[PDB]
């Protein structure tokens, strides 16, 4: 069982958008909950992301696919984004991360 996160690297300019697409694979178990985390540049702690405003989640339990789109991109956003998936058995895994860089 594994979670595939794409893209692992991204660079956008100010005012643009980013869509991170995660897939729960190699399992016979259904997808239950999804979690998105932000690890700031030069941070030793990841804080969970409250999906609101700019943050828009799209879930498809059949494909076992879940994606997060960030509407307006700003410099402040430059951070590592991690997706976490939990199956109905509680098997919990993380995608390899997305290192987004926002430039002007």
């Amino acid at each position: 069982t594994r979670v595939d996160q794409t893209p692992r690297t991204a660079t956008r300019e100010t005012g643009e958008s980013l869509t991170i697409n995660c897939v729960l694979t190699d399992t016979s178990y259904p997808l239950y909950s999804t979690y998105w985390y932000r690890k700031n540049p030069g941070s030793s702690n990841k804080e969970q992301i409250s999906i609101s405003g700019r943050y828009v989640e799209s879930v498809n339990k059949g494909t076992k696919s879940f994606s997060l789109r960030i509407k307006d991109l700003t410099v402040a956003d430059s951070a590592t984004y991690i997706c976490r998936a939990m199956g109905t058995n509680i098997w919990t895994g993380d995608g390899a991360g997305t290192v987004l860089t926002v430039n002007h």
Partner: protein
């Protein structure tokens, strides 16, 4: 893709060679040291061709295929020989079923200190590999990565003690400690494998949620769940004989933990500075973090909420996992087994109540059912610690000796009784709040070892019943037995 090459690159030559040695010794428990050395060197030399070129012949074969072929080559040249005639995956399964915990092997007779120290000096590599082999073959379910840490501890003991005034005074005692720690660790590793091996993950995962939650109370449920998943993977691979995969996965977990300390525990700094084997061992033995400041009662979410049954029905394991996490994080003073009995009680009540027209009225006082369950181990510890404090270790052991012999082989009864006397000596010296976790958790190990010993030669019935009935109810089953 060459798995062997990937494992070699990640583990490094030295660790790869040690792990291959342990793996072979844990299966070919009867074969001489020299036989194993030959096998290891051959495997390592081949791995190196794969490292240089993943496209080299046979480099793309699975580890089980390659390992079985290497072992099997020797075997053709009793029952072990039968496994060799099978094909993968049946062959691996066959070898796994043939890891006999005790087909008896004569106890180790250690050379004299002067001889050992000289051998250590003349050839540290071979000397240390020899010991790795001796321990591994005698303990087939010994957690591989841990054996590597013990090896570095044995190396340190010889390094320090061989240049001391009295070689024996320095060395012999350390060796005795390592031997004892080793047997204990091996017993714990057999308990974990037995759960995975028969029942599967849910039993192990339950234990893990409870233990990790007591240890990392500040961590969120999702984090604990993630850690249980990773730990289950490591443990599963080690238990089935996937030593390299397990070792690398354990290293990766320790790394993940260290890079996410702020989301796990404030007590990990010291460990995360250590060397790679010493770090994982430290993390594994890390003391419980302090629990969050003002934690609310579980009543609101697990008893009062209208969504109890809805949340339970939708994903039972998730809900129960959350119950276990919330209860455990709040109770580092409880044994893991007690916490598991509380979760089982909660599960049974919900399964019954949620079927009713008005579930809430039915499960409204569930927490009351917990009180008698909590008190039983508590009182049992109090009475036994009080009896130990009045008798002393020896007399205490003898009282236990008579008590258990009266209920249900003498050598086994002596050994278990002696160890039980030690539980007393170890645990009763600890403050009341820490007594349950050390006592019940260590007793569950001693009783599992007794079960294993009965299992090889089943002459008794009462013991097998208690042993295979319920893992969480092993001690109460056994404890409650009559003359």
């Amino acid at each position: 893709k060459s798995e062997v090459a990937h494992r070699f690159k990640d583990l490094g030559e030295e660790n790869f060679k040690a792990l291959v040695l342990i793996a072979f010794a844990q299966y070919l428990q009867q074969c001489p040291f020299e036989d194993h050395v030959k096998l290891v060197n051959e495997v390592t030399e081949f791995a190196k061709t794969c490292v240089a070129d993943e496209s080299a012949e046979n480099c793309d074969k699975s580890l089980h295929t390659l390992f079985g072929d290497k072992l099997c080559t020797v075997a053709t040249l009793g029952e072990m020989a039968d496994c060799c005639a099978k094909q993968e995956p049946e062959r691996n399964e066959c070898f796994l079923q043939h890891k006999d915990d005790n087909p008896n092997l004569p106890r180790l007779v250690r050379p004299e200190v002067d001889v050992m120290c000289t051998a250590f000096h003349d050839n540290e590599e071979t000397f240390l590999k020899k010991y790795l082999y001796e321990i591994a073959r005698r303990h087939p379910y010994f957690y591989a990565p841990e054996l590597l840490f013990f090896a570095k501890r044995y190396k340190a003991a010889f390094t320090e003690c061989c240049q001391a005034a009295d070689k024996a005074a320095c060395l012999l005692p350390k060796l005795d400690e390592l031997r004892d720690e080793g047997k204990a660790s091996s017993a714990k590793q057999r308990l974990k494998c037995a759960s995975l091996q028969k029942f599967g993950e849910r039993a192990f995962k339950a234990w893990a949620v409870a233990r990790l939650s007591q240890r990392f109370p500040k961590a969120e449920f999702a984090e604990v769940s993630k850690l249980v998943t990773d730990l289950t993977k490591v443990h599963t691979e080690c238990c089935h004989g996937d030593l390299l995969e397990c070792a690398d996965d354990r290293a990766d977990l320790a790394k993940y933990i260290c890079e996410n300390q702020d989301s796990i525990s404030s007590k990990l700094k010291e460990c995360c500075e250590k060397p790679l084997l010493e770090k994982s061992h430290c993390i594994a033995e890390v003391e419980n973090d302090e629990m969050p400041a003002d934690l609310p009662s579980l009543a609101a979410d697990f008893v009062e909420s209208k969504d109890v049954c809805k949340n339970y029905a939708e994903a039972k394991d998730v809900f129960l996992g959350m119950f276990l996490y919330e209860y455990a994080r709040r109770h580092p003073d409880y044994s893991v087994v007690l916490l598991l009995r509380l979760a089982k009680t909660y599960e049974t009540t919900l399964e019954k109540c949620c079927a009713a027209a008005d579930p809430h009225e039915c499960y409204a006082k569930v927490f009351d059912e917990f009180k008698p369950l909590v008190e039983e181990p508590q009182n049992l510890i109090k009475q036994n610690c009080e009896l130990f404090e009045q008798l002393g270790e020896y007399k205490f052991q003898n009282a236990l000796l008579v008590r258990y012999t009266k209920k249900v082989s003498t050598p086994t009864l002596v050994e278990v009784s002696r160890n039980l006397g030690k539980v007393g000596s170890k645990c009763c010296k600890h403050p009341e709040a820490k007594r349950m976790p050390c006592a019940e958790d260590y007793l569950s190990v001693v009783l599992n070892q007794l079960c294993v010993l009965h299992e090889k030669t089943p002459v008794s019935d009462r013991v097998t019943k208690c042993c295979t009935e319920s893992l969480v109810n092993r001690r109460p089953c056994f404890s409650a037995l009559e003359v």
